[PDB]
């Protein structure tokens, strides 16, 4: 059944809750992006309302077939009345089209629901700061004390520098990025841009890509293989074999693969910096591991819960187990306690 942490008492609302079949009392689902642990279930069949961003709403139209009229796109930063009920969708800092929900109770109440989210200092100064907040249900997936990651941006400079580097050294070298879902496009785009290309792609992703309302993005990306030498291909295909396999398939055009895996956390975070990283080879074809985070470290996490300053946090993720749920519960508390709250 549709698990408590889904649900927002005093509304018939539900948040990223597509796959119980209909839910008894729910007379608005909320979609906090289009990623597919949360989307899992809607489809052209579905017959309610929809709530969700104007890109999330993009994407439901082009890619799952929604029909239009069961699609209710709302603006950032906006108060919008939804069945009665006040509410504000604010940048949650994830993938395209992903946001936050502010929700304003007829009893008084106010509730966050993050939905997937990396925790910024700017969410400081966003519509949050001008009233209190009483319930957090949080974006839990590194929240544990192991989990450090360097900026955004570091990540970019990385990966531009080493891809520059090593097409300058051999002009007959290809570069390839892994995706497998929407999220991280600036790893490919900032690549492509430091190469002078467009990136190139299956007709499948340039698709979902053309949803996204990226400036200039007509200028930016392509079907067309052979004009391109920045590829991306399924994050599955990213490995010797299957890339050997794709080498083959350019016609001699390219003697070289540098290929990028932009990972969540994996454990060489803990004892390596981004200077001093290191791809797997296997002759001509390099694969780099870069950790590009679309959630929270642990630290960022931790300051946006201190100046917030919730009454209650509802985890949304690791719930699954006593173990992790009482992991959890012993940093909320001593995050209250260190800040006073
Ligand atoms: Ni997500």
């Known amino acids: 059944?549709?698990?408590?942490?889904?649900?927002?008492?005093?509304?018939?609302?539900?948040?990223?809750?597509?796959?119980?079949?209909?839910?008894?009392?729910?007379?608005?689902?909320?979609?906090?992006?289009?990623?597919?642990?949360?989307?899992?279930?809607?489809?052209?069949?579905?017959?309610?309302?929809?709530?969700?961003?104007?890109?999330?709403?993009?994407?439901?139209?082009?890619?799952l077939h929604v029909q239009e009229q069961y699609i209710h796109p709302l603006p950032l930063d906006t108060e919008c009345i939804v069945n009665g009920v006040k509410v504000v969708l604010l940048d949650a800092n994830h993938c395209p089209g992903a946001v936050m929900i502010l929700f304003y109770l007829p009893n008084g109440t106010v509730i966050l629901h993050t939905g997937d989210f990396r925790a910024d200092p700017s969410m400081e100064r966003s519509l949050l700061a001008d009233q209190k907040v009483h319930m957090l249900?949080?974006?839990?997936?590194?929240?544990?004390?192991?989990?450090?990651?360097?900026?955004?941006?570091?990540?970019?400079?990385?990966?531009?520098?080493?891809?520059?580097?090593?097409?300058?050294?051999?002009?007959?070298?290809?570069?390839?990025?892994?995706?497998?879902?929407?999220?991280?496009?600036?790893?490919?785009?900032?690549?492509?841009?430091?190469?002078?290309?467009?990136?190139?792609?299956?007709?499948?992703?340039?698709?979902?890509?053309?949803?996204?309302?990226?400036?200039?993005?007509?200028?930016?990306?392509?079907?067309?293989?052979?004009?391109?030498?920045?590829?991306?291909?399924?994050m599955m295909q990213i490995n010797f074999k299957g890339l050997q396999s794709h080498l083959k398939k350019c016609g001699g055009k390219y003697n070289q693969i540098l290929a990028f895996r932009p990972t969540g956390w994996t454990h060489s975070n803990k004892f390596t910096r981004i200077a001093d990283v290191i791809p797997q080879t296997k002759g001509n074809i390099s694969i780099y591991g870069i950790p590009y985070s679309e959630h929270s470290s642990y630290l960022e996490m931790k300051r946006f819960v201190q100046w917030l300053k919730p009454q209650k946090i509802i985890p949304t993720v690791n719930v699954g187990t006593w173990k992790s749920r009482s992991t959890m519960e012993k940093y909320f508390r001593e995050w209250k306690l260190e800040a006073g709250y």
């Open 1 to 63: 059944t549709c698990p408590f942490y889904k649900k927002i008492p005093g509304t018939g609302f539900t948040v990223d809750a597509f796959q119980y079949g209909v839910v008894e009392g729910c007379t608005a689902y909320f979609l906090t992006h289009f990623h597919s642990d949360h989307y899992a279930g809607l489809s052209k069949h579905f017959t309610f309302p929809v709530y969700c961003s104007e890109i999330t709403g993009n994407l439901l139209k082009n890619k």
């Open 137 to 234: 249900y949080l974006d839990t997936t590194y929240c544990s004390p192991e989990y450090t990651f360097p900026s955004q941006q570091e990540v970019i400079r990385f990966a531009i520098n080493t891809a520059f580097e090593a097409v300058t050294l051999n002009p007959h070298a290809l570069v390839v990025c892994g995706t497998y879902s929407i999220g991280k496009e600036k790893v490919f785009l900032a690549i492509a841009d430091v190469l002078g290309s467009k990136v190139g792609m299956s007709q499948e992703k340039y698709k979902t890509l053309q949803c996204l309302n990226i400036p200039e993005i007509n200028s930016l990306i392509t079907t067309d293989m052979c004009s391109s030498l920045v590829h991306l291909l399924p």
